[PDB]
Amino acid sequence: PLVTRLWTIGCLVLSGLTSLRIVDPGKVVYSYDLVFKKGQYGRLLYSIFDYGAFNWISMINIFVSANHLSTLENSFNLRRKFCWIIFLLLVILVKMTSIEQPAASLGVLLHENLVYYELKKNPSIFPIYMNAVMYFVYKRSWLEIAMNFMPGHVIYYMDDIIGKI
Amino acid sequence: PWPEARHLLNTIAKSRDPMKEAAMEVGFYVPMDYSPRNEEKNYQSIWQNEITDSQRHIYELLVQSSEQFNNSEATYTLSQIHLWSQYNFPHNMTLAHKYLEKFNDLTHFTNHSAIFDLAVMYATGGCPQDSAKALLYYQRAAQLGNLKAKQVLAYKYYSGFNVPRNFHKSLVLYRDIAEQLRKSYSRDEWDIVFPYWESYNVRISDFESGLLGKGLNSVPSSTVRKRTTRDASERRIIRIYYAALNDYKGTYSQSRNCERAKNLLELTYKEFQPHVDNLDPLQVFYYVRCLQLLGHMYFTGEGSSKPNIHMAEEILTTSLEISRRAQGPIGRACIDLGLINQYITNNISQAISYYMKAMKTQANNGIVEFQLSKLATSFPEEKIGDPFNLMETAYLNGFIPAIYEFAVMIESGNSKSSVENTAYLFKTFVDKNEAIMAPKLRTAFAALINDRSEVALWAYSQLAEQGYETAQVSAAYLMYQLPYEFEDPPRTTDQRKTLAISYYTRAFKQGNIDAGVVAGDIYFQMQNYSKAMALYQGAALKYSIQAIWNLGYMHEHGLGVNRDFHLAKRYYDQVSEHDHRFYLASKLSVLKLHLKSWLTWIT
């Protein structure tokens, strides 16, 4: 679980830093508006890494979620495809954030869309947990839940038809 | 030759206080230790190099004027130079002693400033101190009618330091001094608006971490004023208001600049007046604040030639009108309007109403109740409070003249007419006005921020005698400060240390706590071990954490007391109790104790 190890370690170290306000929380919450006027992609990587993370519950989330991410990354040696799909996912999510500017940090969004991607290509508590909780939290906005679940299966559908073409 | 000497001396600008020059367009460094040889060599180098040949010839002509003829005026000025380091000459504390001695010989105990300086120098033993000669000089200088002398003598009779305790003498002297002071104010300065003097009663060594460690010292920081503070449209008015304020109540680094703020407020009012309506979100608040500040400025007359009565009056009534909606503050405006319509025009009842409007506000300090009491006394038929009630509330609040009037009233009235209270009152008034008694704080700070550290020691020391605690702690801190752990203690002479002791400890007895800890560590380093515990216990009786822990560490080691581990555990429990954040240290120390006990239990 190399790359997922790095992911969860960065996640937890950012949780530690923000837990003690060692780094200014006003910079990591940088959304598309903020990064966009500022050009600070490092905050986007942070938002992939963090949640505003201090919750022990969120720590459990990190643990079991990164477990899932391993369950998904292991099955393919076609990791170049993984890089393709995550990058395209990132940019389309950036555009939809430009349209929306959601509240949740980018880490939730990335992990959730990857999980949905593999779930539509094909313990069991946490995946259905995350699906339901994100459906609940962003069902209130017309295009927030869109960003949540549409674009992942959008990419998977493109890959599927490329297989079919 | 003396006339030419003086005509030359008019050309060098004795002393510059950058606290004011910084008004046209930080911190500092203190020394850690001292060496008489080091300062001799430094001063020799300065005489060798930096001095300009102009200054060479000037100083030589001066010394020749003072030695050949007993000019009695080249002597005095040369004393003042070699003491205050004016005209950019160095400090010599040995030479100034000699010249002042000669001056005293010349004018035969009649010029009291030299008496004062010489008495202080004999009392601190700068050059062995001998309090008898010092006290005789203080007596003689009080006879001639110098205030500072009478103050320090009265004080010394009130804190009982170096003499038996006496409340009556301090009482009489303070009454006399407060009298001479009250005669120093005009009918206008006293009644109408108090002259506002830049206070420098701030004790030094709060610009650094603090005393005895940060996050540890009990007495709260006292740096009342230094650079108050808190996106294109709104923040303009924010920046403008805060700049106005910062330039009204000058900070410690840079004194006030009056006219600057005047022009800026004139500008911003004239610019923003026609469409004031549109700034409802938040800029309304700050605009009203600036308007009030400007009107107050106008009413005073600072930063200009004379006040504008009607202009400021309409200014403030409009400010009030605007504040009626959006419910901004009402205080300063109402106060000033009362001040105006009470004296300028003679309509009282509206002034009464206004005072009532401002009574329960915040920014009111004491003028409200003082004026109220004066009026009620002049007209008892208004049924407006009780003079005693008002004046007591006032004195409790912190407005100066209230103190004097309150003491006057309370002395004639029983209402617990104990002598201690009257003494305390007169003392607080006398030492609080601070603009006639204690001007040298300014010169002190000035010499401080420009590399002349020694003269700052002198001035602060001379003040410490008068009781200004902050001066006491400052001079101390300049003379011996706590070194970091596993690092050499300073290398200064002993007499320095023994003066630091007495200064710190008197500061302690004054009401401040932490200093006692410093004195205790000083004895400890000096290896007394015997009286230190006294100070420590006295401080712990006021809940000093570091003190209590140090008391423990005193007990558990064999010094003085002999190894009572039980009480030691008890004290560490106590420190862990009164405060929270030290849980870890308490437990860890307890564990050191228990390990020591096991290690003895094995053998």
């Binding site: - | 005895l212 460690g213 752990e485 870890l584």
Partner: protein, 280 residues
């Protein structure tokens, strides 16, 4: 267990942490006045997390050594059971950490990890028991020294948790304070260690059963009836204590999962009841 690359990872991690903590302590020292001050500074956030990492690693190494002392080396089956049953337990302990705020932080994790290591010990000794029974050799009897050695293991565990619960309940009884949440947490940990203690008693009686069996066998009904009897007895006691303790606290969540896992144990209890009826 640990691959070679893991061994070197850990060696470097260890020297990393030693240097790091040494540097932080030395710096914080040099920039301070009094021991009290440097204490207060160490407790700053960054240095706090560094110290805590240090404490964790030292604790784990201590734990490794303690195990090595008590159990020599483990059999692969034991490591399998561990790797099996750790995670959910880890998580539920985290749940136990989740309950209380900054007030109750560090002592809580202390007791939690302690409980964790103890439960690991319990599972280890249980599997060592079942091995002993499988690895039994009738060449010799259950010599008082054999029984006594394994029960030395046992009584170590037993008196350990016993002194623990006694000290905690003494804390409670002496602390009839205003912070009911302290005693709440306490009685929670008590509940845990008592679970463990009842497990001890269970295993003990199971061994006494097998031992008396061997006794009679060398000397001169359905044993399984007695086995399941012990099982239902002990799990009944467990459930009874959980009843009697999660009533006072009125737990929202641990209450539910606890009692439902308990009542499925009661389902299996009724199964065993019916088995005995078939055997009765």
């Amino acid at each position: 267990m640990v691959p070679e690359n893991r061994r070197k990872q850990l060696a470097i991690f260890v020297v990393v942490t030693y240097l790091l903590t040494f540097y932080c302590v030395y710096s914080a020292t040099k920039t301070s006045v009094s021991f009290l001050q440097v204490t207060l500074k160490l407790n700053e956030g960054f240095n706090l997390m560094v110290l805590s990492i240090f404490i964790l690693l030292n604790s784990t190494l201590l734990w490794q050594l303690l195990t090595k002392l008590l159990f020599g080396e483990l059999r692969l089956i034991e490591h399998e059971h561990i790797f099996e049953r750790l995670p959910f337990t880890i998580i539920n302990t985290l749940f136990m950490s989740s309950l209380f705020h900054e007030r109750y932080f560090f002592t809580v994790a202390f007791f939690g990890l302690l409980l964790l290591y103890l439960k690991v010990f319990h599972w280890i000794l249980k599997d060592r028991l079942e091995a002993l029974l499988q690895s039994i050799n009738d060449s010799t009897t259950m010599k008082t020294l054999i029984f006594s050695r394994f029960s030395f293991n046992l009584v170590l565990l037993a008196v350990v948790d016993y002194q623990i619960i006694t000290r905690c309940i003494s804390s409670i009884y002496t602390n009839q304070k205003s912070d009911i949440e302290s005693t709440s947490l306490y009685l929670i940990q008590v509940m845990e260690f008592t679970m463990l203690l009842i497990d001890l008693l269970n295993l003990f009686l199971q061994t006494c059963l097998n031992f008396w069996e061997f006794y009679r066998s060398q000397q001169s009904e359905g044993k399984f009836m007695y086995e399941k009897a012990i099982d239902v007895f002990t799990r009944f006691l467990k459930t009874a204590l959980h009843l009697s303790m999660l009533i006072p606290f009125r737990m929202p969540m641990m209450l539910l999962k606890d009692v439902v896992w308990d009542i499925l144990a009661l389902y299996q209890s009724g199964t065993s009841l019916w088995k005995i009826w078939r055997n009765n």
